[PDB]
Design an enzyme around this catalytic site. Structure first.
Site, PDB file in Angstrom:
ATOM      1  N   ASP A  25     -81.919 -62.584  37.603  1.00 47.65           N
ATOM      2  CA  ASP A  25     -82.154 -63.810  38.344  1.00 47.65           C
ATOM      3  C   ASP A  25     -81.995 -65.024  37.447  1.00 47.65           C
ATOM      4  O   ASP A  25     -82.945 -65.480  36.810  1.00 47.65           O
ATOM      5  CB  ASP A  25     -83.572 -63.738  38.967  1.00 47.65           C
ATOM      6  N   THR A  26     -80.799 -65.596  37.430  1.00 45.90           N
ATOM      7  CA  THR A  26     -80.551 -66.738  36.554  1.00 45.90           C
ATOM      8  C   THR A  26     -81.270 -68.011  36.989  1.00 45.90           C
ATOM      9  O   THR A  26     -81.425 -68.932  36.186  1.00 45.90           O
ATOM     10  CB  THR A  26     -79.048 -67.030  36.437  1.00 45.90           C
ATOM     11  N   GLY A  27     -81.714 -68.056  38.246  1.00 47.12           N
ATOM     12  CA  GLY A  27     -82.531 -69.162  38.753  1.00 47.12           C
ATOM     13  C   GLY A  27     -84.012 -69.045  38.463  1.00 47.12           C
ATOM     14  O   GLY A  27     -84.780 -69.906  38.912  1.00 47.12           O
TER      15      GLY A  27
HETATM   16  C1  LIG Z   1     -86.627 -63.306  46.173  1.00 48.91           C
HETATM   17  C2  LIG Z   1     -85.924 -63.534  44.850  1.00 48.91           C
HETATM   18  C3  LIG Z   1     -86.123 -64.984  44.350  1.00 48.91           C
HETATM   19  C4  LIG Z   1     -87.569 -65.441  44.124  1.00 48.91           C
HETATM   20  C5  LIG Z   1     -85.425 -65.908  45.347  1.00 48.91           C
HETATM   21  N1  LIG Z   1     -85.384 -67.332  44.915  1.00 48.91           N
HETATM   22  C6  LIG Z   1     -84.318 -67.593  43.920  1.00 48.91           C
HETATM   23  C7  LIG Z   1     -84.969 -67.803  42.545  1.00 48.91           C
HETATM   24  O1  LIG Z   1     -83.933 -67.779  41.538  1.00 48.91           O
HETATM   25  C8  LIG Z   1     -85.776 -69.109  42.442  1.00 48.91           C
HETATM   26  C9  LIG Z   1     -84.928 -70.394  42.408  1.00 48.91           C
HETATM   27  C10 LIG Z   1     -85.863 -71.592  42.308  1.00 48.91           C
HETATM   28  C11 LIG Z   1     -86.037 -72.264  41.107  1.00 48.91           C
HETATM   29  C12 LIG Z   1     -86.923 -73.333  41.028  1.00 48.91           C
HETATM   30  C13 LIG Z   1     -87.616 -73.735  42.157  1.00 48.91           C
HETATM   31  C14 LIG Z   1     -87.449 -73.067  43.360  1.00 48.91           C
HETATM   32  C15 LIG Z   1     -86.573 -72.002  43.433  1.00 48.91           C
HETATM   33  N2  LIG Z   1     -86.637 -69.065  41.269  1.00 48.91           N
HETATM   34  C16 LIG Z   1     -87.963 -69.039  41.266  1.00 48.91           C
HETATM   35  O2  LIG Z   1     -88.668 -69.010  42.264  1.00 48.91           O
HETATM   36  C17 LIG Z   1     -88.576 -69.069  39.898  1.00 48.91           C
HETATM   37  C18 LIG Z   1     -89.617 -67.957  39.782  1.00 48.91           C
HETATM   38  C19 LIG Z   1     -89.934 -67.663  38.314  1.00 48.91           C
HETATM   39  C20 LIG Z   1     -91.127 -68.569  38.040  1.00 48.91           C
HETATM   40  C21 LIG Z   1     -90.235 -66.206  37.987  1.00 48.91           C
HETATM   41  N3  LIG Z   1     -89.104 -70.385  39.607  1.00 48.91           N
HETATM   42  C22 LIG Z   1     -88.770 -71.100  38.537  1.00 48.91           C
HETATM   43  C23 LIG Z   1     -89.507 -72.404  38.413  1.00 48.91           C
HETATM   44  O3  LIG Z   1     -87.932 -70.723  37.719  1.00 48.91           O
HETATM   45  S1  LIG Z   1     -85.429 -68.422  46.140  1.00 48.91           S
HETATM   46  O4  LIG Z   1     -85.172 -69.709  45.580  1.00 48.91           O
HETATM   47  O5  LIG Z   1     -86.754 -68.243  46.673  1.00 48.91           O
HETATM   48  C24 LIG Z   1     -84.345 -68.030  47.308  1.00 48.91           C
HETATM   49  C25 LIG Z   1     -83.060 -68.575  47.202  1.00 48.91           C
HETATM   50  C26 LIG Z   1     -82.065 -68.243  48.120  1.00 48.91           C
HETATM   51  C27 LIG Z   1     -82.325 -67.383  49.179  1.00 48.91           C
HETATM   52  N4  LIG Z   1     -81.488 -66.930  50.152  1.00 48.91           N
HETATM   53  C28 LIG Z   1     -82.110 -66.102  51.017  1.00 48.91           C
HETATM   54  S2  LIG Z   1     -83.780 -65.783  50.663  1.00 48.91           S
HETATM   55  C29 LIG Z   1     -83.592 -66.827  49.321  1.00 48.91           C
HETATM   56  C30 LIG Z   1     -84.599 -67.155  48.384  1.00 48.91           C
END
Ligand SMILES: CC[C@H](C)CN(C[C@@H](O)[C@H](Cc1ccccc1)NC(=O)[C@H](CC(C)C)NC(C)=O)S(=O)(=O)c1ccc2ncsc2c1
Lengths: 99, 99
Positions: A25-27
């Site tokens: 998960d690069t995000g």
């Molecule tokens: C279910 C798998 C994941 C959670 C889906 N999401 C993508 C994720 O990379 C997120 C991106 C992020 C970064 C900062 C703030 C908010 C979000 N990271 C995060 O939520 C991370 C969590 C870490 C703290 C561990 N937050 C940060 C600050 O890095 S997600 O953003 O919740 C997401 C994205 C697309 C999608 N399409 C269908 S369901 C779905 C869910």
């Protein structure tokens, strides 16, 4: 390996003799696993994402083998929707994005 | 390009007359953009992440340029704190994970 993204980049990790599937998960800044037992001291922490904040347990300096590559670092444990390998450990295994 | 993961993998995207910064996010199935008043038909959706679910508007066949690479597909718009480029568009620009 090279991993394409037409499917979720799920891989098999090894942590405390247990095999689990986790999402590359690069995000994600950090690594967070679903509820499990890990040995040693932990610190309460809060992390946030798209739906708000959750409480997790922070374990430091934990070995995880990710698709055969060794990392040792911080692993959070809590009510994440899925096991997530974040940038803190992706950097350790030499993972980059390429296009 | 090759993007390392020491910092968040933010890149410039264009959607109409808004150039924006967005996360290249291998953990995101779909592309989720911060609130913007896009033209056209949409459908309501709920997407889940850390902390729970948010309500988004699903727009289809929206052109998006990601670092000079053209893409076109579904874009979800809602109260996300960060613009997220998900796998639906990452595949289109030929993005892989490599270690
Ligand atoms: C279910 C798998 C994941 C959670 C889906 N999401 C993508 C994720 O990379 C997120 C991106 C992020 C970064 C900062 C703030 C908010 C979000 N990271 C995060 O939520 C991370 C969590 C870490 C703290 C561990 N937050 C940060 C600050 O890095 S997600 O953003 O919740 C997401 C994205 C697309 C999608 N399409 C269908 S369901 C779905 C869910």
């Amino acid at each position: 390996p090279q991993i394409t993204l037409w499917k979720r980049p799920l891989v098999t990790i090894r942590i405390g003799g247990q095999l689990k599937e986790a999402l590359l998960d690069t995000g994600a800044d950090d690594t967070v696993l679903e509820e499990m037992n890990l040995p040693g001291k932990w610190k309460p922490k809060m992390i946030g994402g798209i739906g708000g904040f959750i409480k997790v347990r922070q374990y430091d300096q934990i070995p995880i083998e990710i698709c055969g590559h060794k990392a040792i670092g911080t692993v959070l444990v809590g009510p994440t929707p899925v096991n997530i390998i974040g940038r803190n450990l992706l950097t350790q295994i030499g993972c980059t994005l390429n296009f």
